[PDB]
Each structure stands twice: as structure tokens, then as C-alpha cells.
Design a protein around this ligand. Structure first.
Ligand SMILES: CCOC(=O)c1cn(C)c(=O)cc1Cl
Length: 103
């Protein structure tokens, strides 16, 4: 239980983060040219929220994979000095930091 209880804590903390704005909702491929072709497994905080709420995470490890996928996607599609890339680096370092000072 404590495993999934922390997942809620961190997801909430990511959702409300200043740098979270690129990752709150699925990327809209109609608005982002090339996104469909380049990113095979899209992921975002609202998708993780839906699954978490509907109980669909077996372990804290499955949750971490989705979180890391968000930031791997970010780094694959965006330049590191792009506005989205900069936000993703802040978010990625925030996640790894929060996650580790518990596990
Ligand atoms: C809220 C709009 O965010 C974006 O436009 C965007 C988000 N992600 C996660 C990307 O990888 C690329 C863009 Cl353009």
C-alpha cells in the first residue's frame, strides 16, 4: 500500500510543478509535426493519473517506468536547449530526486 501511496504523492507533486506544463496532457500530434513518427510510446501525467486512479499499477516500478518514459520521450523529441527540453530536464531531475529519497 505504501508503495502506491508514494506514487500518488509524487504524481501530485509533478502535476503541480512549475515545469510540468509540457507533460500534463497527451501531446497533440496534429499540432506537433513529426511527433507521431518519432515517439513510439507516448506518455504523460494525465495518462499516468488515469491508470493510477483506476488501480492499474501493480508495483511502484511500473509507475516509475511510465514517469521515465515521459522524460525519455521528451529528450528524444526535443532539443536540450528548447523550452520543452529545459522543462523536461527540470522535471526529470525532480522525479529522480523525489523517488530516491524514499526508496
Ligand atoms: C503543452 C504543449 O506542450 C508541447 O507543445 C509539447 C510537449 N511535449 C511533451 C513534447 O514532447 C513536445 C511539445 Cl511541442
Amino acid at each position: 500500500h505504501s508503495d502506491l501511496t508514494f506514487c500518488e504523492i509524487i504524481l501530485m507533486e509533478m502535476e503541480s510543478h512549475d515545469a510540468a506544463w509540457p507533460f500534463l496532457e497527451p501531446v497533440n500530434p496534429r499540432l506537433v509535426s513529426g511527433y507521431r513518427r518519432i515517439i513510439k510510446n507516448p506518455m504523460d501525467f494525465s495518462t499516468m493519473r488515469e491508470r493510477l486512479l483506476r488501480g492499474g499499477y501493480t508495483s511502484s516500478e511500473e509507475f516509475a517506468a511510465d514517469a521515465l518514459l515521459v522524460f525519455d520521450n521528451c529528450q528524444t523529441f526535443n532539443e536540450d536547449d528548447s523550452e520543452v527540453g529545459k522543462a523536461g530536464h527540470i522535471m526529470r531531475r525532480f522525479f529522480e530526486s523525489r523517488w530516491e529519497e524514499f526508496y
